[PDB]
């Protein structure tokens with residue numbers, strides 16, 4: 001289980017435990033997965049791997065695609081990543097780097113737009129030295145991407161991986177669970193939600209997996 005960010009990552013002026021990162025509460029190193037929607041700029045295994053610090057061969061393997069193909073805009077892909085503990089072993093995160101392309105970008109646009117909510121403004125503020133009001137083109141940010149490793153309880157239940165899923169409008173825990181062939185209660189467990197809680201678009205949600213994720217993700 002990890003606490004759900006619950007749209008606290010919209011409130012960049014305040015610090016919330018969940019927005020600083022998933023807590024290192026299990027094994028210190030594991031294989032994990034992110035998801036990512038291709039865009040005109042990030043439309044190939046090489047460009048996406050560079051942004052997210054994965055490899056083109058891993059993306060090719062996980063999605064059953066060529067390492068050199070383009071992807072139609074808005075294709076959801078899985079991205080295999082290491083997940084390990086960082087910052088005095090406090091957080092599970094996967095580090096990557098991002099150089100600001102245009103002055104005007106902010107910690108929020110980096111976390112929410114460029115990285116599609118795979119990180120948070122608060123984690124970027126906490127883990128970088130730049131004045132949040134004066135970020136400029138060329139600043140090279142460390143971006144702590146959200147991931148986790150299964151807890152002992154989840155492993156005992158048969159979960160091999162956790163995958164960080166990006167919620168879109170019109171999804172429910174049941175529709176997301178159908179993608180991965182898991183019980184939605186296991187998604188609730190993984191995110192410290194109940195069947196009465198809500199999930200929100202443009203937030204990351206951990207999906208516990210018994211097997212590798214499907215090679216093609218279709219929301220509906």
Ligand SMILES: *[C@@H]1O[C@H](CO)[C@@H](O)[C@H](O)[C@H]1NC(C)=O
Nearest residue numbers: 015016017018019020023090
């Ligand atoms: C956040 O975590 C710390 C230590 O883990 C502790 O203050 C408490 O459990 C949480 N509270 C707040 C206000 O963040």
Ligand SMILES: *[C@@H]1O[C@H](CO)[C@@H](O)[C@H](O)[C@H]1NC(C)=O
Nearest residue numbers: 053054055058080081082094
């Ligand atoms: C995993 O960690 C190794 C060693 O730090 C690093 O070289 C590699 O880029 C990482 N790969 C992924 C997919 O996270």
Ligand SMILES: *[C@@H]1O[C@H](CO)[C@@H](O)[C@H](O)[C@H]1NC(C)=O
Nearest residue numbers: 084085086087095127142144
């Ligand atoms: C990830 O980035 C943080 C913040 O700069 C750093 O403290 C940590 O050592 C990094 N972990 C790596 C590179 O494995």
Ligand SMILES: *[C@@H]1O[C@H](CO)[C@@H](O)[C@H](O)[C@H]1NC(C)=O
Nearest residue numbers: 053054082094095096097098
């Ligand atoms: C990729 O992740 C590894 C740790 O797994 C880290 O050492 C390396 O600095 C990262 N690369 C980038 C470009 O941030």
Ligand SMILES: *[C@@H]1O[C@H](CO)[C@@H](O)[C@H](O)[C@H]1NC(C)=O
Nearest residue numbers: 010112113114115116117202
């Ligand atoms: C967050 O990013 C999405 C694209 O991933 C964008 O559509 C949305 O406008 C951004 N959220 C805010 C509050 O600006």
Ligand SMILES: *[C@@H]1O[C@H](CO)[C@@H](O)[C@H](O)[C@H]1NC(C)=O
Nearest residue numbers: 096097098099138140141142
């Ligand atoms: C930003 O830093 C990373 C390592 O933290 C490095 O791999 C990358 O080349 C740097 N970006 C630029 C544009 O120099």
